[PDB]
Write a protein that binds this ligand. Structure first.
Ligand code: ATP
Ligand code: CA
Lengths: 28, 360, 139
Protein backbone atom coordinates (compact mmCIF):
# COMPACT_ATOMS: atom_id res chain seq x y z
CA UNK A 1 0.00 0.00 0.00
CA UNK A 2 1.09 3.59 -0.65
CA UNK A 3 3.45 5.21 1.84
CA UNK A 4 2.28 8.27 3.83
CA UNK A 5 2.08 11.48 1.81
CA UNK A 6 4.46 14.32 2.70
CA UNK A 7 2.79 17.70 3.37
CA UNK A 8 1.61 19.77 0.41
CA UNK A 9 3.36 23.06 -0.50
CA UNK A 10 2.39 25.83 1.96
CA UNK A 11 3.45 28.71 -0.28
CA UNK A 12 -15.17 23.70 -28.97
CA UNK A 13 -14.73 25.06 -32.53
CA UNK A 14 -10.95 24.55 -32.15
CA UNK A 15 -7.77 26.44 -32.89
CA UNK A 16 -8.01 26.20 -36.70
CA UNK A 17 -11.40 28.01 -36.47
CA UNK A 18 -9.85 30.85 -34.43
CA UNK A 19 -7.00 31.08 -36.94
CA UNK A 20 -9.45 31.30 -39.84
CA UNK A 21 -11.38 34.08 -38.15
CA UNK A 22 -8.33 36.21 -37.47
CA UNK A 23 -8.70 39.24 -39.73
CA UNK A 24 -5.27 40.77 -40.23
CA UNK A 25 -5.11 44.45 -40.97
CA UNK A 26 -3.17 46.37 -43.57
CA UNK A 27 -0.04 48.25 -42.55
CA UNK A 28 -0.90 50.89 -41.31
CA UNK B 1 -2.09 46.58 -25.77
CA UNK B 2 -0.24 45.40 -28.89
CA UNK B 3 2.03 42.39 -29.10
CA UNK B 4 5.20 42.34 -31.20
CA UNK B 5 6.31 39.54 -33.52
CA UNK B 6 9.96 39.13 -34.41
CA UNK B 7 11.11 36.39 -36.77
CA UNK B 8 14.88 36.07 -36.45
CA UNK B 9 16.30 34.45 -39.66
CA UNK B 10 19.85 33.60 -40.71
CA UNK B 11 19.62 36.17 -43.51
CA UNK B 12 16.62 38.35 -42.78
CA UNK B 13 14.82 39.67 -39.73
CA UNK B 14 11.04 40.16 -40.18
CA UNK B 15 9.39 42.20 -37.45
CA UNK B 16 6.10 43.97 -36.79
CA UNK B 17 2.86 44.08 -34.79
CA UNK B 18 0.50 41.17 -34.06
CA UNK B 19 -2.69 41.55 -35.99
CA UNK B 20 -0.97 43.16 -39.04
CA UNK B 21 -1.01 41.35 -42.37
CA UNK B 22 2.68 41.95 -43.10
CA UNK B 23 5.87 42.70 -41.19
CA UNK B 24 6.63 46.43 -40.89
CA UNK B 25 10.36 45.79 -41.09
CA UNK B 26 12.38 43.32 -43.15
CA UNK B 27 16.12 43.78 -43.08
CA UNK B 28 19.37 41.80 -43.18
CA UNK B 29 20.44 39.95 -40.00
CA UNK B 30 23.83 41.67 -39.89
CA UNK B 31 25.73 43.84 -37.43
CA UNK B 32 28.79 45.79 -38.59
CA UNK B 33 31.51 47.25 -36.41
CA UNK B 34 34.46 49.43 -37.30
CA UNK B 35 37.00 47.70 -37.97
CA UNK B 36 39.72 50.00 -36.59
CA UNK B 37 27.78 49.55 -34.59
CA UNK B 38 25.51 49.54 -37.66
CA UNK B 39 22.70 47.08 -38.11
CA UNK B 40 20.71 45.90 -41.10
CA UNK B 41 20.42 48.07 -44.19
CA UNK B 42 23.00 50.59 -42.98
CA UNK B 43 25.60 47.86 -42.27
CA UNK B 44 24.85 46.52 -45.78
CA UNK B 45 25.45 49.95 -47.38
CA UNK B 46 28.73 50.38 -45.51
CA UNK B 47 29.81 46.72 -45.77
CA UNK B 48 33.20 47.52 -47.39
CA UNK B 49 34.44 49.39 -44.29
CA UNK B 50 33.00 47.20 -41.49
CA UNK B 51 33.59 43.82 -39.97
CA UNK B 52 30.14 42.30 -40.71
CA UNK B 53 28.78 39.73 -38.31
CA UNK B 54 25.83 37.36 -38.97
CA UNK B 55 24.73 36.50 -35.43
CA UNK B 56 22.30 33.75 -36.54
CA UNK B 57 23.97 30.72 -38.18
CA UNK B 58 21.72 28.06 -39.73
CA UNK B 59 18.86 29.39 -37.65
CA UNK B 60 20.75 29.37 -34.30
CA UNK B 61 21.81 32.50 -32.44
CA UNK B 62 25.57 32.22 -31.97
CA UNK B 63 26.68 35.80 -31.02
CA UNK B 64 24.59 37.18 -28.16
CA UNK B 65 26.17 40.64 -27.98
CA UNK B 66 25.44 41.19 -31.67
CA UNK B 67 21.97 39.61 -31.42
CA UNK B 68 21.18 42.07 -28.65
CA UNK B 69 22.19 44.85 -31.07
CA UNK B 70 19.82 43.44 -33.70
CA UNK B 71 16.93 43.32 -31.22
CA UNK B 72 17.63 46.82 -29.91
CA UNK B 73 17.69 48.10 -33.46
CA UNK B 74 14.45 46.22 -34.24
CA UNK B 75 12.59 47.79 -31.30
CA UNK B 76 14.03 51.32 -31.17
CA UNK B 77 14.77 52.08 -34.82
CA UNK B 78 12.62 49.87 -37.05
CA UNK B 79 9.39 49.44 -35.05
CA UNK B 80 9.93 52.54 -32.86
CA UNK B 81 8.49 50.92 -29.77
CA UNK B 82 9.39 50.70 -26.10
CA UNK B 83 9.79 46.93 -25.55
CA UNK B 84 8.76 47.29 -21.89
CA UNK B 85 5.25 48.20 -23.17
CA UNK B 86 4.73 45.15 -25.45
CA UNK B 87 4.39 41.39 -24.98
CA UNK B 88 6.88 39.93 -27.47
CA UNK B 89 6.61 36.78 -29.58
CA UNK B 90 10.02 35.58 -30.83
CA UNK B 91 10.65 32.76 -33.29
CA UNK B 92 13.23 29.99 -33.10
CA UNK B 93 14.63 27.26 -35.26
CA UNK B 94 13.51 23.66 -34.88
CA UNK B 95 15.78 21.90 -32.28
CA UNK B 96 17.10 25.19 -30.89
CA UNK B 97 19.33 24.25 -27.95
CA UNK B 98 18.00 24.59 -24.42
CA UNK B 99 20.71 26.98 -23.30
CA UNK B 100 19.93 29.28 -26.30
CA UNK B 101 16.19 29.34 -25.46
CA UNK B 102 17.08 30.29 -21.90
CA UNK B 103 19.42 33.11 -23.01
CA UNK B 104 16.77 34.60 -25.30
CA UNK B 105 14.34 34.53 -22.39
CA UNK B 106 16.81 36.12 -19.98
CA UNK B 107 17.70 38.89 -22.43
CA UNK B 108 14.05 39.69 -23.18
CA UNK B 109 13.06 39.99 -19.51
CA UNK B 110 16.28 41.45 -18.05
CA UNK B 111 17.70 43.64 -20.82
CA UNK B 112 14.53 44.67 -22.67
CA UNK B 113 12.18 44.52 -19.70
CA UNK B 114 9.30 42.93 -21.70
CA UNK B 115 6.09 42.32 -19.75
CA UNK B 116 5.59 38.89 -21.34
CA UNK B 117 7.16 36.74 -23.99
CA UNK B 118 6.82 33.51 -25.92
CA UNK B 119 9.12 31.55 -28.22
CA UNK B 120 7.51 29.67 -31.11
CA UNK B 121 9.08 27.27 -33.63
CA UNK B 122 9.18 28.97 -37.03
CA UNK B 123 7.71 25.99 -38.92
CA UNK B 124 4.76 25.80 -36.52
CA UNK B 125 3.95 29.45 -37.30
CA UNK B 126 4.01 28.73 -41.03
CA UNK B 127 1.57 25.86 -40.49
CA UNK B 128 -0.83 28.17 -38.65
CA UNK B 129 -0.52 30.78 -41.42
CA UNK B 130 -1.76 28.08 -43.86
CA UNK B 131 -4.88 27.54 -41.72
CA UNK B 132 -3.84 24.24 -40.18
CA UNK B 133 -2.89 22.82 -36.81
CA UNK B 134 -1.60 19.37 -37.92
CA UNK B 135 0.79 18.84 -40.82
CA UNK B 136 4.41 18.69 -41.85
CA UNK B 137 6.33 21.80 -42.88
CA UNK B 138 9.35 21.93 -45.20
CA UNK B 139 11.03 25.18 -44.15
CA UNK B 140 13.92 26.14 -46.36
CA UNK B 141 15.55 29.50 -45.91
CA UNK B 142 18.95 30.99 -46.43
CA UNK B 143 20.94 29.02 -43.89
CA UNK B 144 18.97 25.90 -42.96
CA UNK B 145 16.32 23.42 -44.35
CA UNK B 146 14.12 21.41 -41.97
CA UNK B 147 11.12 19.11 -42.12
CA UNK B 148 9.00 19.63 -39.05
CA UNK B 149 6.00 17.38 -38.37
CA UNK B 150 3.45 18.97 -36.09
CA UNK B 151 0.51 17.47 -34.18
CA UNK B 152 -2.12 20.01 -33.02
CA UNK B 153 0.41 22.81 -32.88
CA UNK B 154 3.16 20.75 -31.18
CA UNK B 155 6.31 20.07 -33.19
CA UNK B 156 7.54 16.52 -32.84
CA UNK B 157 11.32 16.88 -32.22
CA UNK B 158 12.13 13.15 -32.54
CA UNK B 159 10.99 13.30 -36.19
CA UNK B 160 12.51 16.64 -37.27
CA UNK B 161 14.88 16.20 -40.26
CA UNK B 162 17.53 18.55 -41.57
CA UNK B 163 18.93 18.91 -45.07
CA UNK B 164 22.36 20.37 -44.88
CA UNK B 165 21.92 23.07 -47.58
CA UNK B 166 19.64 25.99 -48.21
CA UNK B 167 19.40 29.22 -50.22
CA UNK B 168 22.97 30.52 -49.68
CA UNK B 169 24.31 27.20 -50.94
CA UNK B 170 22.09 27.42 -54.00
CA UNK B 171 23.31 30.94 -54.78
CA UNK B 172 26.90 29.63 -54.52
CA UNK B 173 26.16 26.72 -56.80
CA UNK B 174 24.50 28.97 -59.41
CA UNK B 175 27.58 31.18 -59.27
CA UNK B 176 29.82 28.14 -59.82
CA UNK B 177 27.90 26.88 -62.84
CA UNK B 178 27.53 30.32 -64.42
CA UNK B 179 31.29 30.71 -63.97
CA UNK B 180 31.76 27.41 -65.82
CA UNK B 181 29.52 28.79 -68.52
CA UNK B 182 32.08 31.65 -68.82
CA UNK B 183 31.00 34.52 -66.56
CA UNK B 184 32.95 35.93 -63.58
CA UNK B 185 31.47 37.09 -60.24
CA UNK B 186 34.29 38.47 -58.11
CA UNK B 187 32.71 41.30 -56.06
CA UNK B 188 29.94 41.31 -53.46
CA UNK B 189 27.68 43.28 -55.86
CA UNK B 190 28.24 40.63 -58.54
CA UNK B 191 27.16 37.88 -56.11
CA UNK B 192 23.92 39.78 -55.40
CA UNK B 193 23.24 39.74 -59.12
CA UNK B 194 23.56 35.94 -59.11
CA UNK B 195 21.13 35.73 -56.16
CA UNK B 196 18.63 37.85 -58.09
CA UNK B 197 18.99 35.64 -61.20
CA UNK B 198 18.35 32.63 -58.95
CA UNK B 199 15.17 34.22 -57.56
CA UNK B 200 13.85 35.37 -61.01
CA UNK B 201 14.83 32.70 -63.55
CA UNK B 202 15.40 29.37 -61.85
CA UNK B 203 12.81 26.57 -61.67
CA UNK B 204 12.43 22.92 -60.68
CA UNK B 205 12.13 20.57 -63.64
CA UNK B 206 9.52 17.86 -63.30
CA UNK B 207 11.63 15.41 -65.33
CA UNK B 208 15.21 16.51 -64.77
CA UNK B 209 16.82 13.99 -67.10
CA UNK B 210 14.52 14.89 -69.98
CA UNK B 211 15.04 18.58 -69.38
CA UNK B 212 18.80 18.11 -69.63
CA UNK B 213 18.40 15.92 -72.73
CA UNK B 214 16.25 18.47 -74.56
CA UNK B 215 17.95 21.68 -73.35
CA UNK B 216 20.23 22.33 -76.38
CA UNK B 217 17.26 22.12 -78.78
CA UNK B 218 14.69 23.96 -76.63
CA UNK B 219 13.27 27.15 -77.99
CA UNK B 220 11.93 28.20 -74.62
CA UNK B 221 14.71 27.45 -72.13
CA UNK B 222 17.28 30.18 -72.64
CA UNK B 223 16.58 33.43 -70.77
CA UNK B 224 18.48 36.74 -70.59
CA UNK B 225 18.89 39.12 -67.64
CA UNK B 226 19.73 42.76 -68.32
CA UNK B 227 21.18 44.90 -65.56
CA UNK B 228 20.31 48.65 -65.27
CA UNK B 229 23.77 49.46 -66.75
CA UNK B 230 23.04 47.32 -69.83
CA UNK B 231 25.19 44.30 -68.97
CA UNK B 232 23.45 41.03 -70.05
CA UNK B 233 23.73 37.57 -68.55
CA UNK B 234 22.17 34.63 -70.42
CA UNK B 235 21.24 31.44 -68.64
CA UNK B 236 20.16 28.04 -70.01
CA UNK B 237 20.16 24.70 -68.26
CA UNK B 238 21.52 26.38 -65.11
CA UNK B 239 17.91 27.60 -64.61
CA UNK B 240 16.84 24.15 -63.44
CA UNK B 241 20.20 22.61 -62.47
CA UNK B 242 20.48 25.05 -59.56
CA UNK B 243 17.34 24.06 -57.59
CA UNK B 244 17.72 20.43 -58.67
CA UNK B 245 20.31 20.35 -55.82
CA UNK B 246 17.42 20.29 -53.33
CA UNK B 247 16.43 16.90 -54.71
CA UNK B 248 19.97 15.80 -55.55
CA UNK B 249 22.46 17.16 -52.96
CA UNK B 250 25.20 15.30 -54.88
CA UNK B 251 25.21 18.34 -57.21
CA UNK B 252 27.21 20.17 -54.54
CA UNK B 253 29.10 17.03 -53.52
CA UNK B 254 27.02 15.69 -50.69
CA UNK B 255 25.75 12.21 -50.04
CA UNK B 256 22.68 13.56 -48.16
CA UNK B 257 19.03 12.75 -48.81
CA UNK B 258 17.14 15.28 -50.90
CA UNK B 259 14.00 17.12 -49.73
CA UNK B 260 11.57 14.46 -50.91
CA UNK B 261 13.45 11.80 -48.91
CA UNK B 262 13.79 13.93 -45.76
CA UNK B 263 10.02 14.57 -45.96
CA UNK B 264 9.28 10.85 -46.28
CA UNK B 265 11.81 9.93 -43.57
CA UNK B 266 10.33 12.50 -41.19
CA UNK B 267 6.76 11.25 -41.68
CA UNK B 268 7.90 7.63 -41.17
CA UNK B 269 9.31 8.59 -37.76
CA UNK B 270 5.88 9.77 -36.66
CA UNK B 271 2.98 7.73 -35.21
CA UNK B 272 1.33 5.46 -37.70
CA UNK B 273 -2.03 7.12 -36.92
CA UNK B 274 -0.95 10.66 -37.95
CA UNK B 275 0.97 9.85 -41.15
CA UNK B 276 -1.97 10.20 -43.54
CA UNK B 277 -2.75 13.66 -42.05
CA UNK B 278 0.88 14.70 -42.49
CA UNK B 279 0.91 13.67 -46.16
CA UNK B 280 -2.37 15.55 -46.73
CA UNK B 281 -1.03 18.69 -45.01
CA UNK B 282 2.46 18.96 -46.40
CA UNK B 283 3.25 22.68 -46.43
CA UNK B 284 6.14 24.56 -48.10
CA UNK B 285 7.64 27.52 -46.27
CA UNK B 286 10.62 29.83 -46.62
CA UNK B 287 12.25 31.64 -49.50
CA UNK B 288 14.00 28.56 -50.91
CA UNK B 289 10.64 26.85 -51.52
CA UNK B 290 9.59 29.62 -53.96
CA UNK B 291 10.98 28.02 -57.12
CA UNK B 292 8.32 27.39 -59.79
CA UNK B 293 7.66 23.66 -60.12
CA UNK B 294 8.66 22.65 -56.58
CA UNK B 295 5.20 21.36 -55.54
CA UNK B 296 4.71 19.28 -58.71
CA UNK B 297 8.15 17.74 -58.29
CA UNK B 298 7.65 17.02 -54.61
CA UNK B 299 4.33 15.32 -55.44
CA UNK B 300 6.00 13.17 -58.09
CA UNK B 301 8.84 12.15 -55.82
CA UNK B 302 6.66 11.52 -52.72
CA UNK B 303 4.30 9.40 -54.83
CA UNK B 304 7.29 7.18 -55.78
CA UNK B 305 8.15 6.73 -52.09
CA UNK B 306 4.56 6.50 -50.82
CA UNK B 307 2.17 5.45 -53.59
CA UNK B 308 -0.91 5.97 -51.42
CA UNK B 309 -0.28 9.73 -51.82
CA UNK B 310 -0.73 9.75 -55.63
CA UNK B 311 -3.73 12.11 -55.58
CA UNK B 312 -2.47 14.26 -52.71
CA UNK B 313 -1.42 17.82 -53.45
CA UNK B 314 1.47 19.64 -51.79
CA UNK B 315 0.44 22.85 -50.06
CA UNK B 316 2.40 25.82 -51.39
CA UNK B 317 0.93 29.00 -49.92
CA UNK B 318 1.49 32.15 -51.99
CA UNK B 319 2.71 34.09 -48.89
CA UNK B 320 5.32 31.52 -47.83
CA UNK B 321 8.34 33.88 -48.00
CA UNK B 322 6.73 35.54 -44.91
CA UNK B 323 4.50 32.84 -43.55
CA UNK B 324 6.54 32.40 -40.38
CA UNK B 325 5.96 36.03 -39.47
CA UNK B 326 2.31 36.01 -40.56
CA UNK B 327 1.57 32.87 -38.46
CA UNK B 328 3.11 34.67 -35.48
CA UNK B 329 0.92 37.72 -36.11
CA UNK B 330 -2.17 35.48 -36.18
CA UNK B 331 -1.16 33.52 -33.10
CA UNK B 332 -0.30 36.49 -30.89
CA UNK B 333 -3.56 38.26 -31.90
CA UNK B 334 -5.77 35.40 -30.64
CA UNK B 335 -7.46 35.11 -27.27
CA UNK B 336 -6.20 31.45 -26.93
CA UNK B 337 -2.70 32.97 -26.66
CA UNK B 338 -3.29 34.97 -23.48
CA UNK B 339 -2.68 31.76 -21.47
CA UNK B 340 0.45 30.89 -23.47
CA UNK B 341 2.68 33.90 -22.68
CA UNK B 342 5.41 33.67 -20.08
CA UNK B 343 4.73 36.58 -17.75
CA UNK B 344 7.34 38.62 -15.87
CA UNK B 345 5.95 37.09 -12.69
CA UNK B 346 6.56 33.57 -14.02
CA UNK B 347 10.09 34.49 -14.98
CA UNK B 348 10.82 36.12 -11.60
CA UNK B 349 9.64 32.94 -9.85
CA UNK B 350 11.26 30.29 -12.08
CA UNK B 351 14.11 32.00 -13.97
CA UNK B 352 15.02 31.46 -17.67
CA UNK B 353 14.33 27.70 -17.51
CA UNK B 354 10.62 28.57 -17.48
CA UNK B 355 10.88 28.57 -21.32
CA UNK B 356 11.39 24.81 -21.25
CA UNK B 357 8.12 24.32 -19.41
CA UNK B 358 5.97 26.80 -21.31
CA UNK B 359 7.17 26.93 -24.93
CA UNK B 360 6.85 23.82 -27.03
CA UNK C 1 -3.67 13.85 5.15
CA UNK C 2 -2.99 11.57 2.18
CA UNK C 3 -2.53 11.37 -1.53
CA UNK C 4 -6.10 12.42 -2.38
CA UNK C 5 -5.13 15.91 -1.13
CA UNK C 6 -2.54 15.98 -3.91
CA UNK C 7 -5.20 15.32 -6.50
CA UNK C 8 -7.28 18.19 -5.02
CA UNK C 9 -4.26 20.51 -5.24
CA UNK C 10 -3.57 19.61 -8.86
CA UNK C 11 -7.24 20.07 -9.83
CA UNK C 12 -7.83 23.29 -7.90
CA UNK C 13 -7.03 25.84 -10.59
CA UNK C 14 -9.52 24.41 -13.08
CA UNK C 15 -7.00 23.77 -15.90
CA UNK C 16 -6.91 19.96 -15.66
CA UNK C 17 -9.52 17.25 -16.23
CA UNK C 18 -7.47 14.37 -14.80
CA UNK C 19 -4.55 13.94 -12.44
CA UNK C 20 -2.80 10.99 -10.75
CA UNK C 21 0.08 10.03 -8.50
CA UNK C 22 1.39 6.57 -9.43
CA UNK C 23 4.13 4.83 -7.47
CA UNK C 24 6.85 3.14 -9.56
CA UNK C 25 9.03 2.30 -6.51
CA UNK C 26 8.20 0.75 -3.13
CA UNK C 27 4.46 0.44 -3.84
CA UNK C 28 3.91 0.13 -7.55
CA UNK C 29 0.23 1.13 -7.95
CA UNK C 30 -2.06 4.15 -8.46
CA UNK C 31 -1.73 6.02 -5.15
CA UNK C 32 -4.45 8.55 -6.04
CA UNK C 33 -6.36 9.68 -9.09
CA UNK C 34 -9.42 11.62 -10.15
CA UNK C 35 -12.36 9.26 -9.79
CA UNK C 36 -14.09 8.00 -12.94
CA UNK C 37 -11.54 9.45 -15.35
CA UNK C 38 -8.67 7.85 -17.31
CA UNK C 39 -5.52 7.77 -15.17
CA UNK C 40 -7.24 5.82 -12.34
CA UNK C 41 -7.06 2.84 -14.78
CA UNK C 42 -3.30 3.01 -15.52
CA UNK C 43 -1.74 -0.42 -15.61
CA UNK C 44 1.71 -1.75 -14.58
CA UNK C 45 2.40 -2.43 -18.31
CA UNK C 46 1.75 1.18 -19.12
CA UNK C 47 4.00 2.38 -16.27
CA UNK C 48 6.61 -0.02 -17.68
CA UNK C 49 6.57 1.73 -21.04
CA UNK C 50 6.80 5.18 -19.41
CA UNK C 51 9.91 4.27 -17.34
CA UNK C 52 11.41 1.53 -19.53
CA UNK C 53 14.78 1.43 -21.24
CA UNK C 54 13.20 1.52 -24.78
CA UNK C 55 12.77 5.23 -25.58
CA UNK C 56 12.10 4.63 -29.29
CA UNK C 57 9.22 2.20 -29.86
CA UNK C 58 6.58 4.61 -28.50
CA UNK C 59 7.11 6.64 -31.70
CA UNK C 60 5.70 3.75 -33.88
CA UNK C 61 2.10 4.67 -32.86
CA UNK C 62 2.33 5.93 -29.32
CA UNK C 63 1.58 4.66 -25.88
CA UNK C 64 -1.47 4.26 -23.70
CA UNK C 65 -2.48 5.65 -20.32
CA UNK C 66 -5.51 3.90 -18.82
CA UNK C 67 -6.15 2.53 -22.32
CA UNK C 68 -6.21 6.09 -23.80
CA UNK C 69 -3.97 6.28 -26.84
CA UNK C 70 -1.48 9.17 -26.74
CA UNK C 71 1.32 10.51 -28.95
CA UNK C 72 4.67 11.41 -27.45
CA UNK C 73 5.67 15.01 -28.10
CA UNK C 74 8.79 15.41 -25.86
CA UNK C 75 10.53 12.71 -23.82
CA UNK C 76 12.95 13.75 -21.10
CA UNK C 77 11.39 11.47 -18.46
CA UNK C 78 14.62 9.62 -17.56
CA UNK C 79 16.83 12.68 -17.53
CA UNK C 80 17.56 13.64 -13.87
CA UNK C 81 17.47 17.45 -14.46
CA UNK C 82 14.20 17.43 -16.50
CA UNK C 83 12.22 14.36 -15.51
CA UNK C 84 9.24 15.11 -17.81
CA UNK C 85 7.39 13.79 -20.82
CA UNK C 86 4.74 15.67 -22.82
CA UNK C 87 2.03 13.91 -24.81
CA UNK C 88 -1.24 14.67 -26.51
CA UNK C 89 -4.12 12.22 -26.67
CA UNK C 90 -5.22 10.69 -29.94
CA UNK C 91 -8.85 10.44 -31.03
CA UNK C 92 -11.03 9.22 -33.82
CA UNK C 93 -13.65 11.24 -35.68
CA UNK C 94 -12.10 14.58 -34.88
CA UNK C 95 -13.16 14.38 -31.22
CA UNK C 96 -11.12 16.76 -29.01
CA UNK C 97 -7.65 15.80 -27.85
CA UNK C 98 -5.82 16.95 -24.73
CA UNK C 99 -2.31 17.67 -23.55
CA UNK C 100 -0.75 15.43 -20.93
CA UNK C 101 2.46 15.77 -18.92
CA UNK C 102 4.10 13.00 -16.90
CA UNK C 103 6.86 13.83 -14.44
CA UNK C 104 9.10 11.47 -12.48
CA UNK C 105 10.06 11.87 -8.84
CA UNK C 106 12.13 9.55 -6.62
CA UNK C 107 9.15 7.21 -6.04
CA UNK C 108 6.27 8.46 -8.21
CA UNK C 109 5.01 9.50 -11.56
CA UNK C 110 2.76 12.60 -11.50
CA UNK C 111 0.31 12.71 -14.45
CA UNK C 112 -1.86 15.63 -15.56
CA UNK C 113 -4.32 16.03 -18.45
CA UNK C 114 -5.56 19.42 -19.49
CA UNK C 115 -9.09 20.41 -20.24
CA UNK C 116 -9.99 21.15 -23.86
CA UNK C 117 -7.99 24.08 -25.26
CA UNK C 118 -5.56 24.28 -22.32
CA UNK C 119 -2.03 24.72 -23.67
CA UNK C 120 0.59 22.07 -23.04
CA UNK C 121 2.89 24.63 -21.45
CA UNK C 122 0.53 25.35 -18.62
CA UNK C 123 0.14 21.62 -17.92
CA UNK C 124 3.92 21.00 -18.09
CA UNK C 125 4.60 23.94 -15.70
CA UNK C 126 2.09 22.61 -13.13
CA UNK C 127 3.34 18.99 -13.33
CA UNK C 128 6.94 20.04 -13.11
CA UNK C 129 6.27 22.20 -10.02
CA UNK C 130 4.51 19.32 -8.28
CA UNK C 131 7.28 16.85 -9.10
CA UNK C 132 9.82 19.44 -7.87
CA UNK C 133 7.93 19.69 -4.53
CA UNK C 134 7.81 15.90 -4.17
CA UNK C 135 11.49 15.52 -4.98
CA UNK C 136 12.37 18.19 -2.40
CA UNK C 137 10.31 16.11 0.03
CA UNK C 138 12.35 12.94 -0.70
CA UNK C 139 9.49 11.40 -2.69
N1 ATP D 1 11.65 33.65 -55.37
C1 ATP D 1 12.69 32.96 -54.86
N2 ATP D 1 13.20 31.88 -55.42
C2 ATP D 1 14.20 31.15 -54.88
N3 ATP D 1 14.83 31.51 -53.76
C3 ATP D 1 14.40 32.61 -53.10
C4 ATP D 1 13.27 33.41 -53.62
N4 ATP D 1 13.06 34.43 -52.78
C5 ATP D 1 14.01 34.32 -51.81
N5 ATP D 1 14.82 33.23 -51.98
C6 ATP D 1 15.91 32.78 -51.14
O1 ATP D 1 15.35 32.56 -49.83
C7 ATP D 1 16.38 32.77 -48.86
C8 ATP D 1 15.77 33.67 -47.76
O2 ATP D 1 14.70 32.89 -47.20
P1 ATP D 1 14.17 33.21 -45.73
O3 ATP D 1 13.88 34.66 -45.53
O4 ATP D 1 13.06 32.22 -45.59
O5 ATP D 1 15.46 32.78 -44.88
P2 ATP D 1 15.94 33.26 -43.39
O6 ATP D 1 14.73 33.18 -42.45
O7 ATP D 1 16.70 34.51 -43.42
O8 ATP D 1 16.93 32.07 -43.06
P3 ATP D 1 16.78 30.67 -42.30
O9 ATP D 1 15.30 30.38 -42.23
O10 ATP D 1 17.61 29.68 -43.10
O11 ATP D 1 17.36 31.04 -40.93
C9 ATP D 1 17.60 33.37 -49.60
O12 ATP D 1 18.55 32.37 -49.90
C10 ATP D 1 16.94 33.85 -50.88
O13 ATP D 1 17.84 33.94 -52.01
CA1 CA E 1 13.49 31.50 -41.41
Amino acid sequence: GPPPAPPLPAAAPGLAAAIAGAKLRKVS
Amino acid sequence: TTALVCDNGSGLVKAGFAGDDAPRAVFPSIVGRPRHSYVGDEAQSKRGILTLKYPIEHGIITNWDDMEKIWHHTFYNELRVAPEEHPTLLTEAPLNPKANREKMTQIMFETFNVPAMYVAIQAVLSLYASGRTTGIVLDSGDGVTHNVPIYEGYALPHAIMRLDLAGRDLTDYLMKILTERGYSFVTTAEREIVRDIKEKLCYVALDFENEMATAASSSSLEKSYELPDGQVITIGNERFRCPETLFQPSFIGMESAGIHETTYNSIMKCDIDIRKDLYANNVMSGGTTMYPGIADRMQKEITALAPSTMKIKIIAPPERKYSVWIGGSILASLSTFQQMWITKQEYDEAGPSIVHRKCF
Amino acid sequence: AGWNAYIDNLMADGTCQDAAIVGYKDSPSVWAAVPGKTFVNITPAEVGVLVGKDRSSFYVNGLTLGGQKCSVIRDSLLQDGEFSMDLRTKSTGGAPTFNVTVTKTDKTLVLLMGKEGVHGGLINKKCYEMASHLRRSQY
